[PDB]
Amino acid sequence: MEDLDALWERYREAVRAGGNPQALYQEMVWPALLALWREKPRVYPAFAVSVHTLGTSPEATALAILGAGAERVYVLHTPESARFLPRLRQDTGKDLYPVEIGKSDVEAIYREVKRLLEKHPEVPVALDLTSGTKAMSAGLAAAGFFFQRFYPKVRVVYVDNEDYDPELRRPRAGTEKLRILPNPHEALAEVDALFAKELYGKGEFGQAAAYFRGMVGRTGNQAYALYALLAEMYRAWRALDFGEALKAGRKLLGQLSQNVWLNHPLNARREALEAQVALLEAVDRFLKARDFALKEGVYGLARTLLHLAQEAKEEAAVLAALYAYRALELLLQERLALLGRRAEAPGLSPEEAEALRKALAELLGVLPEEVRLPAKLGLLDLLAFLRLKGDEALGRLSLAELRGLAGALKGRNSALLVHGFDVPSPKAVEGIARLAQGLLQDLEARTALGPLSPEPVPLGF
Amino acid sequence: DLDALWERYREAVRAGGNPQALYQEMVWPALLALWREKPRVYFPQAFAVSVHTLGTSPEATALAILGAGAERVYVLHTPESARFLPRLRQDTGKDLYPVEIGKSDVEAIYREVKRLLEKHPEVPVALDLTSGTKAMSAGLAAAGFFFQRFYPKVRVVYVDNEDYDPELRRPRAGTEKLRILPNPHEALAEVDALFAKELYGKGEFGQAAAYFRGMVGRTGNQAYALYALLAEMYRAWRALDFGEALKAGRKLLGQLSQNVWLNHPLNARREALEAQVALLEAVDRFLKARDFALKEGVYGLARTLLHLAQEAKEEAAVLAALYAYRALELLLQERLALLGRRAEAPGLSPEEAEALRKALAELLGVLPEEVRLPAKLGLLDLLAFLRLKGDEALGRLSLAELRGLAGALKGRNSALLVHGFDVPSPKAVEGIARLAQGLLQDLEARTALGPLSPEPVPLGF
């Protein structure tokens, strides 16, 4: 090695004397450097296959072949650099499997890497980008980091070096070292936040929380524990577990009020978070009481259900119907509470029951004698009853709209996930959600929560 | 023009002149002029920001800056390439924003690119990798393609050429052109299958179908259309849209029967597919008839609901309870039918009603007068009635087991998403689902389907 450092200087001074650079490199330097790499590869801390781009200088590639020490060696060369395959054979002693590519045909690099990984799918593979055009090297690296998703044993490698002489177009002999170029997730920790943020923006709150919690496990940065709490709060809220959501939100607000978290980015949104936690509190209170005097909790629950129905409208129509039916039922029951009455025991007088059978018969296209009122008012019975009692919000419904909704309202309990086998049309679910929305805006005006959305607050990064 | 200039340059070099100084004197002014007049840029592109690595080759970075035409220009240089910043300012005429990095510090590339995208989050940004070490260029490309996931307007760019003279270490003048380097996702069609197969493996059937549809177009290969149908069938099945699931499964089976597709990989799992489609057909039949003599459809619907309940139990227990209650209800009604009683309105004599009130009281630990029998039997009422009528499966349950189930069973209709406000424990869902599973295993033996799983068949690639 100090032999190598001494003859490097001998070479340098011979070049300053007028000796040719390439010739004296081949004669004085390269045999000793090559012998060193044969005996002892300068390799950072397993490869079964190595794949090497090949440009106009074969020496870097010879070193990378010896450093990876793979049994199977592929060489991605161009029509122009094919001339160097004999030298590669004689310097490495390896069988070469050559693949010709254009020097900036990045797609072909991608395709050849695909083909090779499919040929060697479960062994460690080194992708050496040292030699070639920037297009070849960058294409090989890009292909490697892309395919690690599906071929995790792939590694991108590089003959790093120290004293690159721009005149000599070579580094100082003996400073070369083969090493692994890390992928961005491996290299830069904060990029995990990006994955978490993406999942959060998709409504995948449980996975987002898992990512944030794993980041605290990786780096110890407790700022991401607060983000995990937030994602956990939304996970629980979207799953209708208002107790767990309230607990997570209260923990989060408590943490954000500590001096150490004063500049956490979620504090830029504190009021929004406080309002959402107030909503969760109100819903928790209403769920415990089951009493429709608690207007804020009725609003919070119906708002949550209508938002869930809107999100399920495309991918989950059966659930969308269920959410929309429950929201409308809650809102109609709150209207009945405006009259002091309860749907499970409305206390209909004989005159009221007769009038209700007549109105239901007109809506259902039957005779009043065919209408049988259950002990607990069904959804359509409740709507008809409120109209009979002069409810101002339901009185505004046209007869055409109500006739259009009558089939869907009548079949509330006949839904597949309640007691029957039916799925109403998406158009009817749309009409049920529209009716519910109008009742919700009436209630929203009468509640201390004001208008509030379940949409998540922006993360602030 | 530039052709004749390049021949004059090569001639002056042949005559012993200094290649680099002669490039600076004879070639570089004409090329720089040309890139100021009309830069050679492959379809013309508009960038707001450009980011440039800088090695020992400032000419390439000047061409890249002028080609990108960005208002804001960042230069990622090393301590060794810093001395080139003044000349790069003169050639381009731009205010440069320099950022220092080590020549192999790939983490530093990732960090600085991340900072710059955060500073310019919504504008098109060019990452020029032409000049620098291979670690710098490959790091910039890898950073670009990685961050495209989160910053879609990022592009990786490169000053390519038609010919490069390896002795002069220069592109042939006037053959340089600024090119976008494609990311491996957009350059390789076939990779979409791997993504689909990943999504399919995680049960994301809609996205898997979407990727399969994409592949059909980008390749010539209608084979992927079959995969798309399979994914659509599972999507519809999980969403409880049995009609659409059956439509897709029948279309798929009919295509797998054509001569062209006899070697399709799905035909390796043909038997399983056929069985799943028959289950779907039986469920579709049962949903139209709503009659518990159709044992196969009862089995298929209860099996589907129990699978969904098991999937939802841990993180969506409200929904899991809804699914598990429906599954258990169906199975108990089928067992009422099997006893020869009407499964939707068993006609209890006053003597049977009295006996059932006594049995429920002894069970619930209350007095008989505190038990009220609704017009529709609840789950607990129905289970106790089946036990009174000598049902053997249910007769095997112990008193301890029944009292452990009694709370959950009484809460069928008081579930939040039915008529009430209950938010259940995953433990209560587990009890309901385990009772249902036992009844399902009993019905399995009495059905022409036999045992079948809603678990997706392997793709076979």
Numbering used by the authors:
A (entry chain B): 1 to 45, 49 to 464
B (entry chain A): 3 to 44, 46 to 464
Q: Can I see the authors' text?
A:
Type III CRISPR systems are innate immune systems found in bacteria and archaea, which produce cyclic oligoadenylate (cOA) second messengers in response to viral infections. In these systems, Csm6 proteins serve as ancillary nucleases that degrade single-stranded RNA (ssRNA) upon activation by cOA. In addition, Csm6 proteins also possess cOA-degrading activity as an intrinsic off-switch to avoid degradation of host RNA and DNA that would eventually lead to cell dormancy or cell death. The two TtCsm6 monomers dimerize in an X-shape, and each monomer contains an N-terminal CARF domain, an intermediate helix-turn-helix (HTH) domain and a C-terminal HEPN domain.
In this study, we initially determined the crystal structure of TtCsm6 in complex with cA4 in its post-cleavage state, uncovering the mechanism of how TtCsm6 recognizes and cleaves cA4. The overall structure is similar to that of apo-TtCsm6, with a root-mean-square deviation (RMSD) value of 1.0 Å. Compared to the apo form, the CARF domain bound by A2 > P undergoes a significant movement in the mobile loop spanning residues from 165 to 179, which encloses the two A2 > P molecules into the catalytic pocket of CARF domain. The two A2 > P molecules bind to a composite site across the TtCsm6 dimer interface. The adenine group of A1/A1ˊ accepts two hydrogen bonds from residues T81 and E83, while their 2ˊ, 3ˊ-cyclic phosphate is stabilized by residues T59, K137 and R172. On the other hand, the adenine group of A2/A2ˊ is specifically recognized by R173 and E179 from the mobile loop, while the 2ˊ-OH group is stabilized by N164. Upon cA4 binding, the primary conformational change occurs in the CARF domain, where a mobile loop along with the two helices situated above the catalytic center switch from an open to a closed conformation, completely enclosing the cA4 molecule within the catalytic center. It is worth noting that while the CARF domain bound by A2 > P also displays a closed conformation compared to the apo form, it is noticeably distinct from the conformation observed in the cA4-bound state. On the contrary, these interactions were not observed in the A2 > P-bound structure, where the HTH domain adopts a conformation similar to that of the apo state. On the contrary, the conformation of HEPN domain including the R-X4-6-H motif in the A2 > P-bound state is essentially identical to that of the apo state.
